[PDB]
PDB file of C-alpha atoms and ligand atoms in Angstrom:
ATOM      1  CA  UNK A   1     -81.593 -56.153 -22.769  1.00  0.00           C
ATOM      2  CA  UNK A   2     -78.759 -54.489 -23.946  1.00  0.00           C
ATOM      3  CA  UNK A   3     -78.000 -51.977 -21.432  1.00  0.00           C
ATOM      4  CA  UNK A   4     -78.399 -47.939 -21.708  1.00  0.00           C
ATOM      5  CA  UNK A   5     -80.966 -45.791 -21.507  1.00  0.00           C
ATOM      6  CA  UNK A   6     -84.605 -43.821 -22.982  1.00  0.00           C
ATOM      7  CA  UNK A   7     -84.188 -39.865 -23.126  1.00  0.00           C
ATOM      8  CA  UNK A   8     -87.499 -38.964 -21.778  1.00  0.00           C
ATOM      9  CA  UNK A   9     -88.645 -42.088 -21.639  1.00  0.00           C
ATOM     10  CA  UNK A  10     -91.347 -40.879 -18.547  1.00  0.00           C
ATOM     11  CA  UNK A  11     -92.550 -38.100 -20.911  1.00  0.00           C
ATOM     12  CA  UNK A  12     -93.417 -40.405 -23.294  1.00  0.00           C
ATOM     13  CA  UNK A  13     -95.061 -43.095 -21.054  1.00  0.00           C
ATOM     14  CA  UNK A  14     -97.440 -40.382 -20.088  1.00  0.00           C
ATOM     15  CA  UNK A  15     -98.530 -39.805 -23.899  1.00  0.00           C
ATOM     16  CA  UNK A  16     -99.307 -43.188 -23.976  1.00  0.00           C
ATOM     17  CA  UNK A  17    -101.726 -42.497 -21.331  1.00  0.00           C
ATOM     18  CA  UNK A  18    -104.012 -40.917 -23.906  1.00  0.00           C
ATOM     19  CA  UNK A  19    -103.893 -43.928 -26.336  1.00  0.00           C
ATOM     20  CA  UNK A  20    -106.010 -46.582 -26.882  1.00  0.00           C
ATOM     21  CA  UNK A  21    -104.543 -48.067 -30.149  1.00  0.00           C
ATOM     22  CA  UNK A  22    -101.610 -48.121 -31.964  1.00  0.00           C
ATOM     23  CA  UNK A  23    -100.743 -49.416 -35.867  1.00  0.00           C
ATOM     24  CA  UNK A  24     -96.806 -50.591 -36.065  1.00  0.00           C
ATOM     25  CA  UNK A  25     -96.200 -49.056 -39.955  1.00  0.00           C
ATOM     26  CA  UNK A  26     -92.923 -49.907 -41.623  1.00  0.00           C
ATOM     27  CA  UNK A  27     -91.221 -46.230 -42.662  1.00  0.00           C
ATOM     28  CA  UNK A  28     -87.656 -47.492 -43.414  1.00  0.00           C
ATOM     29  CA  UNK A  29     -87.455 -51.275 -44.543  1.00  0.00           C
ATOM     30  CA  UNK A  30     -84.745 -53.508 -43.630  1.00  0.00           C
ATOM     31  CA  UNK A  31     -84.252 -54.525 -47.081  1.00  0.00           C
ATOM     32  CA  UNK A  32     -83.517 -51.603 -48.984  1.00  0.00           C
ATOM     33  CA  UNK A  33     -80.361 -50.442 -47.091  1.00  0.00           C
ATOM     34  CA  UNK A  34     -77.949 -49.551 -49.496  1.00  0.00           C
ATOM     35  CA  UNK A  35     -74.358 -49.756 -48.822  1.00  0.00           C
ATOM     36  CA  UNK A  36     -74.686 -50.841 -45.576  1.00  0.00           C
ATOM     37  CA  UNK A  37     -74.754 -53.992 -43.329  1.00  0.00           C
ATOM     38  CA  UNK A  38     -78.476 -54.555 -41.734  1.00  0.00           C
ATOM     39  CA  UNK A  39     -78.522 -58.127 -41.044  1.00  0.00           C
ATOM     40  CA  UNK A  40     -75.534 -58.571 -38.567  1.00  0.00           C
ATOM     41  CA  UNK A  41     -76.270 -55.934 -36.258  1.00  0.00           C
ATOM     42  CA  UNK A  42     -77.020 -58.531 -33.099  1.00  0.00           C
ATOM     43  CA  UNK A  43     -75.715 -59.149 -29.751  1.00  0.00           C
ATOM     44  CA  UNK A  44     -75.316 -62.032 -27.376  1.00  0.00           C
ATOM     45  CA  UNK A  45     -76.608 -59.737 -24.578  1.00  0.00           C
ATOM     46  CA  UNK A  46     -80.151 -60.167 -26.485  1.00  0.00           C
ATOM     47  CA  UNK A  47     -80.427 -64.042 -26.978  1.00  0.00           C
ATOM     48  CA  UNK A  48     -83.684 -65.235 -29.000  1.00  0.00           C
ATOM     49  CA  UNK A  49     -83.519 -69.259 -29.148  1.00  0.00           C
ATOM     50  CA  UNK A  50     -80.316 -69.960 -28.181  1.00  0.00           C
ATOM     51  CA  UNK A  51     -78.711 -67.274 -30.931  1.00  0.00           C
ATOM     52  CA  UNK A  52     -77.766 -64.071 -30.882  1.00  0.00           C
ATOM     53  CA  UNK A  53     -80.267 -61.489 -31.344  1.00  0.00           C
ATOM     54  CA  UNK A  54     -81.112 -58.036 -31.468  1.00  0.00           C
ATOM     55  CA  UNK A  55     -84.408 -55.729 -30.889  1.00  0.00           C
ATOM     56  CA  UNK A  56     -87.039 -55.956 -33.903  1.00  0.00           C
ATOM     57  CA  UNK A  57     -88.275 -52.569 -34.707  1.00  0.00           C
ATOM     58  CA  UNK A  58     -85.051 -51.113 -35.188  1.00  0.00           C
ATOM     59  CA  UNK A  59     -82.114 -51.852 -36.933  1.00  0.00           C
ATOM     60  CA  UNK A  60     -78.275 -51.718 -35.869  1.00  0.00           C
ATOM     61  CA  UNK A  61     -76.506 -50.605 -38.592  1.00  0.00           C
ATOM     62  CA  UNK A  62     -72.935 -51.815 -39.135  1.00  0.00           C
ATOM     63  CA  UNK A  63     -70.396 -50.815 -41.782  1.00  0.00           C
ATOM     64  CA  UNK A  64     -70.119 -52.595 -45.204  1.00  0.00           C
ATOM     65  CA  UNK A  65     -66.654 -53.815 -46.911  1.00  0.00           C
ATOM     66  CA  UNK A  66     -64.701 -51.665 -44.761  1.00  0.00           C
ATOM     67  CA  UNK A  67     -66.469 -48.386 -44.841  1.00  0.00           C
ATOM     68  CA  UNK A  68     -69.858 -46.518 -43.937  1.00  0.00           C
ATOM     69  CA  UNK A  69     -70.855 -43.842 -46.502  1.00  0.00           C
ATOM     70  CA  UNK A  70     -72.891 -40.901 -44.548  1.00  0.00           C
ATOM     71  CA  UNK A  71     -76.388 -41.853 -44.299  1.00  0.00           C
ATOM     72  CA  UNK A  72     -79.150 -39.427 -45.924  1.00  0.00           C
ATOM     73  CA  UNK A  73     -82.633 -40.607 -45.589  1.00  0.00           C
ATOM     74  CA  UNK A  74     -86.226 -39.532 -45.051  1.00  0.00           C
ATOM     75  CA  UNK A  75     -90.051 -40.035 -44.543  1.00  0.00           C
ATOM     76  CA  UNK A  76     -92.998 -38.103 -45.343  1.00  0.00           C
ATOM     77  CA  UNK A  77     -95.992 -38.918 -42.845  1.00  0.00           C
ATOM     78  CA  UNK A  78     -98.848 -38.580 -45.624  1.00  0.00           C
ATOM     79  CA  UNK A  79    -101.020 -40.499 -42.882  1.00  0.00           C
ATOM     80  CA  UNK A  80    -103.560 -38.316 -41.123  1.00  0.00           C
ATOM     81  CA  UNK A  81    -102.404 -39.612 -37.692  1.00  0.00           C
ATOM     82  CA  UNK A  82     -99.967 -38.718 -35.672  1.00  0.00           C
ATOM     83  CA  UNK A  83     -97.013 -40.543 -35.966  1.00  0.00           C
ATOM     84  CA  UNK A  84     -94.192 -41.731 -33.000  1.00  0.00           C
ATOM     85  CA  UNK A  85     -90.781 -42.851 -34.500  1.00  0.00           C
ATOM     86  CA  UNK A  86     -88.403 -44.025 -32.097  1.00  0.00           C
ATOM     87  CA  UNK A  87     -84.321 -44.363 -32.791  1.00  0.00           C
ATOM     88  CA  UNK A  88     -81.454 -44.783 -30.916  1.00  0.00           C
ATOM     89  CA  UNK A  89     -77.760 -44.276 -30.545  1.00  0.00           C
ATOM     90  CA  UNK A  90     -74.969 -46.589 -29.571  1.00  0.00           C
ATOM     91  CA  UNK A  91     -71.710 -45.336 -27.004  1.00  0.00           C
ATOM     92  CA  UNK A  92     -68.981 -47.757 -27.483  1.00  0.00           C
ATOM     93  CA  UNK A  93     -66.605 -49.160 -25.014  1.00  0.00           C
ATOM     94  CA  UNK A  94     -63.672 -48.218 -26.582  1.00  0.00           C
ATOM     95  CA  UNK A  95     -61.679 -46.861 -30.378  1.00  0.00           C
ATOM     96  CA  UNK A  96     -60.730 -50.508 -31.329  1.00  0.00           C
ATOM     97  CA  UNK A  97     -64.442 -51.395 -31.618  1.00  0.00           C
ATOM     98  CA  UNK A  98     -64.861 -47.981 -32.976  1.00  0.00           C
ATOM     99  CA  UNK A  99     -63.111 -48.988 -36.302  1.00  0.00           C
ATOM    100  CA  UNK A 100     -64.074 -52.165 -35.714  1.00  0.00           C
ATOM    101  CA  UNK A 101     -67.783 -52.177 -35.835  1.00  0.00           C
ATOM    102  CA  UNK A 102     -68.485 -48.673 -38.238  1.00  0.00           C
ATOM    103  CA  UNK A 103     -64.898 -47.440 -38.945  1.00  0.00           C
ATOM    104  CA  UNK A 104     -64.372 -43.751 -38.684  1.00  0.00           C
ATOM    105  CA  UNK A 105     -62.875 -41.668 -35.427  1.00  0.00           C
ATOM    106  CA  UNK A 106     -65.667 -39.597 -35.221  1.00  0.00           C
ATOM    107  CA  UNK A 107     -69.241 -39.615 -35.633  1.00  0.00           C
ATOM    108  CA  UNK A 108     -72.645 -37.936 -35.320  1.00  0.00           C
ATOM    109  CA  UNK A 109     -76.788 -38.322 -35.417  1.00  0.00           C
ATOM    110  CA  UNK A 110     -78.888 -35.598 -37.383  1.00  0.00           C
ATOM    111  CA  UNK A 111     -82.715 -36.262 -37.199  1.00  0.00           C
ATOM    112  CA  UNK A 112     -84.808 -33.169 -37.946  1.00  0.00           C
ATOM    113  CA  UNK A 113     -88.589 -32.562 -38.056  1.00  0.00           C
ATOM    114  CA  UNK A 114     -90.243 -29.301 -38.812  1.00  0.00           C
ATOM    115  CA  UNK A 115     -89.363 -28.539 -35.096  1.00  0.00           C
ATOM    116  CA  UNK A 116     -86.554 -30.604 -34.180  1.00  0.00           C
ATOM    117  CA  UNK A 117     -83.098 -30.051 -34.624  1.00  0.00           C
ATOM    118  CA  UNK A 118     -80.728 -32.865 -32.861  1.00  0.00           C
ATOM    119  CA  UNK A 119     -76.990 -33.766 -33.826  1.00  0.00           C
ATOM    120  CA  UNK A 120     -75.765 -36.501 -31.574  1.00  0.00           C
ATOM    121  CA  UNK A 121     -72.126 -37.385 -30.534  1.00  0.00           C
ATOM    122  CA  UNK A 122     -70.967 -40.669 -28.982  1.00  0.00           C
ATOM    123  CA  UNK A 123     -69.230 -40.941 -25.779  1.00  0.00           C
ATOM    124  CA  UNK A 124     -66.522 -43.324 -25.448  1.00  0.00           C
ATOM    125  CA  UNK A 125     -65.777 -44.340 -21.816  1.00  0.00           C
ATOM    126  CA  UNK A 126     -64.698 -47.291 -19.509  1.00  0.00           C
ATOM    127  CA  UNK A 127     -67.875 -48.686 -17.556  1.00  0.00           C
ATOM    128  CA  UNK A 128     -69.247 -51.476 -15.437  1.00  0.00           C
ATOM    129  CA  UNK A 129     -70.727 -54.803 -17.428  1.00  0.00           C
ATOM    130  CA  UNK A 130     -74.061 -54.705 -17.649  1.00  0.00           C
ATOM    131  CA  UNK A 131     -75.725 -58.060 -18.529  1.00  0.00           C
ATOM    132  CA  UNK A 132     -72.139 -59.100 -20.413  1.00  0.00           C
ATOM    133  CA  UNK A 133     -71.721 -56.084 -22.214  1.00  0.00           C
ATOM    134  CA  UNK A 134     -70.158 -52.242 -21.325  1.00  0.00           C
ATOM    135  CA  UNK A 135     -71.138 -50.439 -24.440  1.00  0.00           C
ATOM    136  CA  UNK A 136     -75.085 -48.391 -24.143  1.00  0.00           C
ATOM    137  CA  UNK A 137     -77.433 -48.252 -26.544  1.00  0.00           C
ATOM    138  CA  UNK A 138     -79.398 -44.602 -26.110  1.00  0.00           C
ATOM    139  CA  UNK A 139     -82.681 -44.278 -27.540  1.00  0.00           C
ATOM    140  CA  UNK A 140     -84.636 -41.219 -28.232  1.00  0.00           C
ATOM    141  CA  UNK A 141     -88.055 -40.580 -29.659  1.00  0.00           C
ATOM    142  CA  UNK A 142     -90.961 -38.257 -31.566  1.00  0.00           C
ATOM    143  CA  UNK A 143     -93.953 -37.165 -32.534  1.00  0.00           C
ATOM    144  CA  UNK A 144     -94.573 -36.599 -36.424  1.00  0.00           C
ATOM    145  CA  UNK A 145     -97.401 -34.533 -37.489  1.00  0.00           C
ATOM    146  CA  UNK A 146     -99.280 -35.265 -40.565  1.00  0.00           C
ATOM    147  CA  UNK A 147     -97.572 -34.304 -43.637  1.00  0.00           C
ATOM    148  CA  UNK A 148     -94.113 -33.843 -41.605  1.00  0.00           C
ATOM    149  CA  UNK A 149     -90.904 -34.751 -43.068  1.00  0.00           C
ATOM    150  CA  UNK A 150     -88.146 -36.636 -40.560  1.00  0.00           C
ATOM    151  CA  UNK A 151     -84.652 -36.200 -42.314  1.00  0.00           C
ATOM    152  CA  UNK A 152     -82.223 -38.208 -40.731  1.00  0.00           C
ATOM    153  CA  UNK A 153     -78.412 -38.046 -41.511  1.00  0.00           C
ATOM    154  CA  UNK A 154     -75.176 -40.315 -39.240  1.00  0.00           C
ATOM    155  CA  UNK A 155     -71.946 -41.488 -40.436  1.00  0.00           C
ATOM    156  CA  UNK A 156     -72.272 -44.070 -37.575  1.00  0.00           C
ATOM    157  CA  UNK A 157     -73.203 -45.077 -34.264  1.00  0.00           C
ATOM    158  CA  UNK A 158     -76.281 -45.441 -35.690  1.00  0.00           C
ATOM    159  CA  UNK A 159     -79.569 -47.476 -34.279  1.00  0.00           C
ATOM    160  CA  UNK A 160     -82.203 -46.718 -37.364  1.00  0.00           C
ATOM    161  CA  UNK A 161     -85.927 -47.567 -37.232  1.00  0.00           C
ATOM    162  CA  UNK A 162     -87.773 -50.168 -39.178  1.00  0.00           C
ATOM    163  CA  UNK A 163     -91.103 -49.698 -37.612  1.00  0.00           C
ATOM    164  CA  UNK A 164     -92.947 -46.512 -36.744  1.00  0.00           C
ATOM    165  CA  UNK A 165     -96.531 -46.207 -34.338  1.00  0.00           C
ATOM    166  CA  UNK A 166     -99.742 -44.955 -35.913  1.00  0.00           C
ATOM    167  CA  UNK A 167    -101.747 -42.912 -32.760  1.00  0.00           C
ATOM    168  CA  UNK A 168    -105.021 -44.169 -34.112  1.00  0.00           C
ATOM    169  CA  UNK A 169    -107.693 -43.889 -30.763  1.00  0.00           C
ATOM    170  CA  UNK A 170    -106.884 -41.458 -28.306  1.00  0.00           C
ATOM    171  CA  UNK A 171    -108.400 -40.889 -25.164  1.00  0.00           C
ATOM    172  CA  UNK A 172    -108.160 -42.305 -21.866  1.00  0.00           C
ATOM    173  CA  UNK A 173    -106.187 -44.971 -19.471  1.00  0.00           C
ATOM    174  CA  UNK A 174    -103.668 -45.207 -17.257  1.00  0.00           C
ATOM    175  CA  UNK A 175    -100.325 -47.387 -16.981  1.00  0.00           C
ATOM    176  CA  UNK A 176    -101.250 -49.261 -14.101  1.00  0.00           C
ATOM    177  CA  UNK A 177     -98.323 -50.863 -11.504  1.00  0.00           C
ATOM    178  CA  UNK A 178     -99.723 -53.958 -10.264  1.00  0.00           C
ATOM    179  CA  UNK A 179     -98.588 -57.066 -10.231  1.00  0.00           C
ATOM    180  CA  UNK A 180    -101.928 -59.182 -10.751  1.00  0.00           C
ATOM    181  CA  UNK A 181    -102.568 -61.066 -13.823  1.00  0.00           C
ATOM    182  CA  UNK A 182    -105.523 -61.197 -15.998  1.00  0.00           C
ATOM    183  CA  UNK A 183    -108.747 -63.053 -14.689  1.00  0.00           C
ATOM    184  CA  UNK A 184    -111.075 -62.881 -17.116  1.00  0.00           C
ATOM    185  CA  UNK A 185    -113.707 -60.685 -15.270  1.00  0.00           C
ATOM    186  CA  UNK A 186    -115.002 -57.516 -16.324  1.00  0.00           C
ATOM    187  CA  UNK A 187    -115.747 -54.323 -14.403  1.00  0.00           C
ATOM    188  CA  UNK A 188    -116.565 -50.603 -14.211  1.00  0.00           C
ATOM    189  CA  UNK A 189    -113.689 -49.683 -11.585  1.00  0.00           C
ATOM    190  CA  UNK A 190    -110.475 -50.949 -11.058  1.00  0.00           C
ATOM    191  CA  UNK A 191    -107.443 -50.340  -9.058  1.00  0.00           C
ATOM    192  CA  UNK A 192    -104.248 -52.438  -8.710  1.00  0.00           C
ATOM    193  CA  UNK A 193    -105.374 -54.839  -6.263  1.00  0.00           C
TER     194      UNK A 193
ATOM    195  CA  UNK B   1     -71.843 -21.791 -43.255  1.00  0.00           C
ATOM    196  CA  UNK B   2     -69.312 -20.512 -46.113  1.00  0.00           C
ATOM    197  CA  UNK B   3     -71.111 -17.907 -47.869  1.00  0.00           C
ATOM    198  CA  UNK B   4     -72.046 -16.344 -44.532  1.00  0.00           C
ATOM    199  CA  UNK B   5     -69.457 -16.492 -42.337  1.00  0.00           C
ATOM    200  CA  UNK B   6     -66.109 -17.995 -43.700  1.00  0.00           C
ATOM    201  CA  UNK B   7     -65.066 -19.702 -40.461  1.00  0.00           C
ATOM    202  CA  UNK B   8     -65.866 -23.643 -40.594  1.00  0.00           C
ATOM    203  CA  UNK B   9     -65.530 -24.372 -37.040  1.00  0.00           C
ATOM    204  CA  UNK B  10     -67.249 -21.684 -34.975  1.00  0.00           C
ATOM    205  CA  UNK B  11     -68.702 -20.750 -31.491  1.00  0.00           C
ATOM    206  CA  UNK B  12     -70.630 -18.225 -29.174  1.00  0.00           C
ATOM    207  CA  UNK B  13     -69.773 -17.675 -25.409  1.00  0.00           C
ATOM    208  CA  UNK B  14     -71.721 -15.336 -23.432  1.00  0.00           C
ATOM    209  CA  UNK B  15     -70.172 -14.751 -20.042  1.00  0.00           C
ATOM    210  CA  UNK B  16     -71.234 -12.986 -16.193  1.00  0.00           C
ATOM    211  CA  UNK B  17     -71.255 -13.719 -12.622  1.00  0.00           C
ATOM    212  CA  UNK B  18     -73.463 -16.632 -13.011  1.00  0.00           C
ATOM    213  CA  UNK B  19     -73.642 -17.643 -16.458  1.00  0.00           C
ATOM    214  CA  UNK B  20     -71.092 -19.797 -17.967  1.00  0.00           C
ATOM    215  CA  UNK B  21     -72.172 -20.891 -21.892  1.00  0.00           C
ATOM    216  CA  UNK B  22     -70.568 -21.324 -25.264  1.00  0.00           C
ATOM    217  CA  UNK B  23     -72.500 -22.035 -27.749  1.00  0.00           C
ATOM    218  CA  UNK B  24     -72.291 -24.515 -31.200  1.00  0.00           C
ATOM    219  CA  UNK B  25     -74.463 -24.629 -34.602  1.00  0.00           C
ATOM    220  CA  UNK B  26     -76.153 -28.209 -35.401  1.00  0.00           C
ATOM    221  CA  UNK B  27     -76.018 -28.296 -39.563  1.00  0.00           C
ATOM    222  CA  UNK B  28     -78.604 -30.622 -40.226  1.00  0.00           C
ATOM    223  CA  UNK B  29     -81.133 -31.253 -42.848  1.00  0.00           C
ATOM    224  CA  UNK B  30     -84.957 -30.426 -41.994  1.00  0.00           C
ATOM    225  CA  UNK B  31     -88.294 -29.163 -43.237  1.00  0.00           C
ATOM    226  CA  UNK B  32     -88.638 -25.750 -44.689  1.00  0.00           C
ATOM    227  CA  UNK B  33     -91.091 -22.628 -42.918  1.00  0.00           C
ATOM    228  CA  UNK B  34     -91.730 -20.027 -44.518  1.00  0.00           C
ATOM    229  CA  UNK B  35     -89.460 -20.431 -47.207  1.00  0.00           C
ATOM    230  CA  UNK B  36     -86.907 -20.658 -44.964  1.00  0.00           C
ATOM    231  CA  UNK B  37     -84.842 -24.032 -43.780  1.00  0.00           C
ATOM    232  CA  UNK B  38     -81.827 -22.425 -41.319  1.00  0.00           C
ATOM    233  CA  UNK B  39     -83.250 -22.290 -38.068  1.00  0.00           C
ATOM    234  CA  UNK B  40     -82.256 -19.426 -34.970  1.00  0.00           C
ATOM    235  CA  UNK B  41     -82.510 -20.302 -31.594  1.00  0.00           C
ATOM    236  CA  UNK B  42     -82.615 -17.214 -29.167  1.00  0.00           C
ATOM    237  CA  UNK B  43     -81.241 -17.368 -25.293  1.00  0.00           C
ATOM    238  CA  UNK B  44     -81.742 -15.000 -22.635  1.00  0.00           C
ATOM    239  CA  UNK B  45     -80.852 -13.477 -18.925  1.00  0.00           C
ATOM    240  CA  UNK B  46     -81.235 -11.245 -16.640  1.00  0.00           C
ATOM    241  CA  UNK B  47     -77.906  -8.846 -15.846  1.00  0.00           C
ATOM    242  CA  UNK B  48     -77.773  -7.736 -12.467  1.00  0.00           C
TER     243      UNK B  48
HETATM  244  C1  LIG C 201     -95.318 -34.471 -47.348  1.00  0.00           C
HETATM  245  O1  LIG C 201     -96.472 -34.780 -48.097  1.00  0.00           O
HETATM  246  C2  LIG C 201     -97.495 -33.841 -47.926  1.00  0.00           C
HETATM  247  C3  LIG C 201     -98.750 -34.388 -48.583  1.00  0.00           C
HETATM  248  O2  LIG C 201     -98.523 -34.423 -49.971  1.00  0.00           O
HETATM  249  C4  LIG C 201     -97.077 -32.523 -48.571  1.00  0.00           C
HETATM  250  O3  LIG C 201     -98.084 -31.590 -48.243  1.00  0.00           O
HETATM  251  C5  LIG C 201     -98.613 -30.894 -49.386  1.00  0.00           C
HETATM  252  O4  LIG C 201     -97.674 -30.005 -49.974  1.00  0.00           O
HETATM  253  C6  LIG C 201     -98.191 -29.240 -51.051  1.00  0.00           C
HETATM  254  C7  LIG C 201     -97.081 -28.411 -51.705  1.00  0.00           C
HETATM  255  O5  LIG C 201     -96.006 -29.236 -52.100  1.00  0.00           O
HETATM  256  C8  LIG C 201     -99.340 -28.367 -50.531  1.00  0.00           C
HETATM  257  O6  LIG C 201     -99.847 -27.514 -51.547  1.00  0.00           O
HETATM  258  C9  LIG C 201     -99.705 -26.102 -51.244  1.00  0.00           C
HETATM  259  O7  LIG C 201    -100.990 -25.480 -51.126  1.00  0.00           O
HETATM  260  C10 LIG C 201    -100.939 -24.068 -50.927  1.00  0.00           C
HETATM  261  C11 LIG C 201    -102.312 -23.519 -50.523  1.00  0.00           C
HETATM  262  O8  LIG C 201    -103.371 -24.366 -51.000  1.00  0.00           O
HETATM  263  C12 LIG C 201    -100.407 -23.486 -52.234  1.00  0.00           C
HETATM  264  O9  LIG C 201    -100.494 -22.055 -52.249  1.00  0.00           O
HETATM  265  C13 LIG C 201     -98.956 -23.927 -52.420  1.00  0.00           C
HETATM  266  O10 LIG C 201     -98.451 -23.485 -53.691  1.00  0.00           O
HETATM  267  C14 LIG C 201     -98.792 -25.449 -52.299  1.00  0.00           C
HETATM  268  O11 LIG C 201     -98.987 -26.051 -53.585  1.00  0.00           O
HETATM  269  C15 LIG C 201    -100.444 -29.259 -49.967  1.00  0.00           C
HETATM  270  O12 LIG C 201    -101.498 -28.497 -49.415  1.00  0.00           O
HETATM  271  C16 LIG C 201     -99.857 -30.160 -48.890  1.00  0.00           C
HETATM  272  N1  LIG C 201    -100.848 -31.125 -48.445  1.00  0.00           N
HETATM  273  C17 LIG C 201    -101.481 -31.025 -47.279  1.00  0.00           C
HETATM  274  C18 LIG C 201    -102.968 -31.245 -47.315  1.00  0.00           C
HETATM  275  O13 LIG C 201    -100.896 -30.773 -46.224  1.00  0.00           O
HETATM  276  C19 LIG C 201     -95.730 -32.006 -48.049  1.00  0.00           C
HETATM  277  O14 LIG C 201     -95.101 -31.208 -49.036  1.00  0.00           O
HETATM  278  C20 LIG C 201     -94.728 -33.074 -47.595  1.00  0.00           C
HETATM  279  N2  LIG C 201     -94.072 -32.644 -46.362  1.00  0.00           N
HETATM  280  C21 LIG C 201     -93.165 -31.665 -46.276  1.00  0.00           C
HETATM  281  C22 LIG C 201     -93.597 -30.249 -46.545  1.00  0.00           C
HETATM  282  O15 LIG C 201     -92.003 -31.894 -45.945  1.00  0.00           O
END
């Protein structure tokens, strides 16, 4: 709803061919951020009854007094599943909401697994309006192993997650492109029409 | 990024006929292997 893009967002569709289940775990709660802002990071280009709202299993992080100290946190995945944690980055539409939103010129994302090593950089730029807005959200995902660290690190620009997805059964399905809805029936085969 | 090699800001940039790169190193805090946390990534081509 508000506008950008998923970085391998077909990649990751076809994981989720292999799973039957998952289990929506809270990693980072919404509560205990710090010296930050968590509860006004919404948008009009999201509207939930009437009000302005934002997506609910991650958090937009905006700046607090008038400053956002660098961001240092972590999670262990002591689970014996495997574990995918999606976050995201937001590109402003210009410097003036730069300062205005999470304050300082420049800014960068540092997630890092046991193999993953990612520093992200805004891009400021004049664009089209998209559903009201011109500013993109970018999103970005992984796959934690059991007993994997995630150590993220942004001084802001920042899209955090609350939620994380427990793979609990794997094996087999498709994501199937009709158009049909449910009927109640039950089968052995079935195709899109 | 002291201790090793003084410069803050740094880069590579290998240059040919076709290839064109410069290259940047992401600091960022992650999981240590064999009790090591620094990471290398290697590149590669083929000179004509
Ligand atoms: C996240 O939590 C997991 C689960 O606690 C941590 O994994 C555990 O780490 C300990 C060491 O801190 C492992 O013990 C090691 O065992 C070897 C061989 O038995 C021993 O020679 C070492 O001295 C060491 O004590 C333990 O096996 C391991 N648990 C399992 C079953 O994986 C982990 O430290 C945390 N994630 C990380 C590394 O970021």
């Amino acid at each position: 709803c508000y506008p950008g893009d998923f970085n391998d967002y077909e990649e990751l569709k076809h994981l989720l061919s292999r799973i039957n289940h998952f289990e929506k775990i809270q990693i980072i709660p919404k509560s205990s951020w710090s010296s930050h802002e968590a509860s006004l990071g919404v948008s009009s280009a999201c509207p939930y009854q009437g009000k302005s709202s934002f997506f609910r299993n991650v958090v937009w992080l905006i700046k607090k007094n008038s400053t956002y100290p660098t961001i240092k946190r972590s999670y262990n995945n002591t689970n014996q599943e495997d574990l995918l944690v999606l976050w995201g980055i937001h590109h402003p539409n210009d410097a003036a909401e730069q300062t205005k939103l999470y304050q300082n010129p420049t800014t960068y994302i540092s997630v890092g697994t046991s193999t993953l090593n990612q520093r992200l950089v805004p891009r400021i730029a004049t664009r089209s309006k998209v559903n009201g807005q011109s500013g993109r959200m970018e999103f970005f995902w992984t796959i934690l192993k059991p007993n994997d660290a995630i150590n993220f690190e942004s001084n802001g620009n920042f899209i955090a997650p609350e939620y994380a997805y427990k793979i609990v059964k794997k094996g087999d399905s498709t994501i199937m492109k009709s158009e049909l809805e449910y009927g109640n029936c039950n089968t052995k085969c079935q195709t899109p029409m």
